[PDB]
Design a protein around this ligand. Sequence first.
Ligand SMILES: Cc1cn([C@H]2C[C@H](O)[C@@H](COP(=O)(O)OP(=O)(O)OP(=O)(O)O)O2)c(=O)[nH]c1=O
Ligand SMILES: [Mg+2]
Lengths: 388, 388
Amino acid sequence: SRVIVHVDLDCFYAQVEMISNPELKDKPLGVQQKYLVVTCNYEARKLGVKKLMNVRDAKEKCPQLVLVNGEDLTRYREMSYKVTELLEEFSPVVERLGFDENFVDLTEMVEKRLQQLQSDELSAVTVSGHVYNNQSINLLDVLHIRLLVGSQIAAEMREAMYNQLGLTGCAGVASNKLLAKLVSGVFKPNQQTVLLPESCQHLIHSLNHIKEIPGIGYKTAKCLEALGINSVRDLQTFSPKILEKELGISVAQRIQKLSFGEDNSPVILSGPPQSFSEEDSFKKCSSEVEAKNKIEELLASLLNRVCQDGRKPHTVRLIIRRYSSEKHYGRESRQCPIPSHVIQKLGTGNYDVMTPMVDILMKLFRNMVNVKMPFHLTLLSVCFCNLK
Amino acid sequence: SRVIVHVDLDCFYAQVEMISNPELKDKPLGVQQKYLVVTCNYEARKLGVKKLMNVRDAKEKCPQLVLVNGEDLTRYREMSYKVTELLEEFSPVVERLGFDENFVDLTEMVEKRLQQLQSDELSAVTVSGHVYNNQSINLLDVLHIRLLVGSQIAAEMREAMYNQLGLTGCAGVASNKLLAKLVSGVFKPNQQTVLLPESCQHLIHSLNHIKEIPGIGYKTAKCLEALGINSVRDLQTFSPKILEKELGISVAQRIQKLSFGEDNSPVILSGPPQSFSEEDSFKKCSSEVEAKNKIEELLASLLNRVCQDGRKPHTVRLIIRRYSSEKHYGRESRQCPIPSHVIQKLGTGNYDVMTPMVDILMKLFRNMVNVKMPFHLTLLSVCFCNLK
DNA sequence: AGGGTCCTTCCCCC
DNA sequence: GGGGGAAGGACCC
Ligand SMILES: Cc1cn([C@H]2C[C@H](O)[C@@H](COP(=O)(O)OP(=O)(O)OP(=O)(O)O)O2)c(=O)[nH]c1=O
Ligand SMILES: [Mg+2]
């Protein structure tokens, strides 16, 4: 009964770099972080198997591949909220997912539009964009009409996004978040797709691995595998009772519903930010005692954000992880309710505030006792988080 | 600037029993939990029954000692919220602490009374109850007048509590929560005491051990004892730096401040419960076998409270504890999500879920998993934790 | 690489 | 019985 739209922008970071420097346009571009080509424009994703997640390693394919550093997220973040606000203008309930994805619940909006339609030209409702599996529309099917109207809102949102902000992107319209997200990616470049109910199974079985299902990460994908479960149908037909008594009645019942294209999670209002953090890294270069000056830097930038945006962090930490072969995690981080007075004027010219963050950041850091001394580490972050 | 009142009822449970069964008011009474005297009135406390164990012990030393069972908390919990609601009527910001204590921030109320007061009847203001250290009042001291007005509201709250609910209790009036709670117990049975600023140190140094300070339990008392800190003054004078480097910068600063009677924590509006837990402890009533039936009971009662409350529990918890020496450390717990659309049902067959909670608790209970010692360390404990 | 948002364990304290 | 601080997970994008 719900009409949800999932908006996913094209190579977001690359798009923000091109809009700020046309001389980069129509030129195989990739945005680089430390030693990572986080993403690149389409005129490169084909120009050398240059996809996301690769590094200078992928520069191999036509090294004429331009590069721009994308470590500072400031500009991406700002454009990201502009997209979200623009979307919130069409309808208030908008959920963010990373900096370039937005879920929008259009149910109420779609309905108001249909009501305003006389019982005469409601037979002229057409679709905007693609119909997922070239599925035939049935004008007398109330659910088809609502999703078509939904495709119309999507096209208006993408038009607005392009005309007002200069950004292109994809959109997917379906009856729930899972489906909307899966279908928004069927026609990748700058297009949109709507999913009619009769094609839900076709979309779900088009996936090659249960890992491709939104809501099934690296971990659970591993558990299921140990049970032989590899394909979407494997999960659809697996024994409920056993999966339940294997991952928990809560998770078991949820992930299995997803294998069928069922997902009742509501689109959540992703009102202002809940935490700010600035992490600066040195790729595994920490000696354990000579990192401290960096803390004075990365946390240095945060203040500028907090001061810019109101409200203050009544919390802090630093997050660290020791990585090796396989998986990542960490037992690094120290939090404390910062000083009342400091928290109330974190923009009145004081920088002595850093010393008190440094004492709790690292000298009051590590573990119980004094004994052995092994170092190793990989990049670390600090959170300015709970925010009230 | 702040005026806080701490309300603490006299032997709450015994008092609620004495009201239900009137013929007990003149006979020494103690309330019994499964074989431990949780509390007793001031007619039996005279013989000195400081919440001791084994009824028979004190029973034989008081032949006319008629005891009642206090395992079912339903009645106490109800009377407990009648108290809070009555207090919320005087002023909205009311914080609960257990079933018999309530903090109320009277700051705004006191001022309203002062401003509404004339410029002549300002020298007429008098105290209600005891002045802590028999300290002289200075009418021209704004802090004094405001605390005296606060003692006026405390007497009215105690009076209303007796006339409307039949309960007596003590009240403490001070400038923060720590001091309000310390001074409310100076004159113990059914009386109130206000603390003027000049006597704060006298009140704080009247304690015989740093663990008597509200906010310092067993754990901290021990970590302080190992540092050569036993008296309140030992803590006021201890080196900050060393303490910070020992307990953390946040606890260090907080714990030490309390040593001087400084406590800035705001009175928190408790509002309706957040949880609906029911813990059944038992002196070794069973091993591994038949908890299914225990779950059926603990969860059964919770289903009438949840229904009467009007809200639905989106998470269920369960914490286990095992037997250990000296302090009985028994912290142990697992928690998870709860089913939607079925579980929060209203239909006459709402109880069928019983089997779901059973499984759901069993997988959490087993994750503590027979391999540690975990089975039969103590009884059961459930929480319906988180209600919206 | 950056930069977030829920969960979850304790651990403490009346 | 009932609250909050911690800290890391596990997904994210
Ligand atoms: C996934 C992933 C994304 N990103 C950044 C890079 C992208 O610009 C931005 C958006 O995430 P994505 O949408 O997955 O990347 P994309 O928009 O560049 O690719 P597409 O055109 O197919 O939608 O967030 C990260 O920094 N790290 C990550 O691990
Ligand atoms: Mg994208």
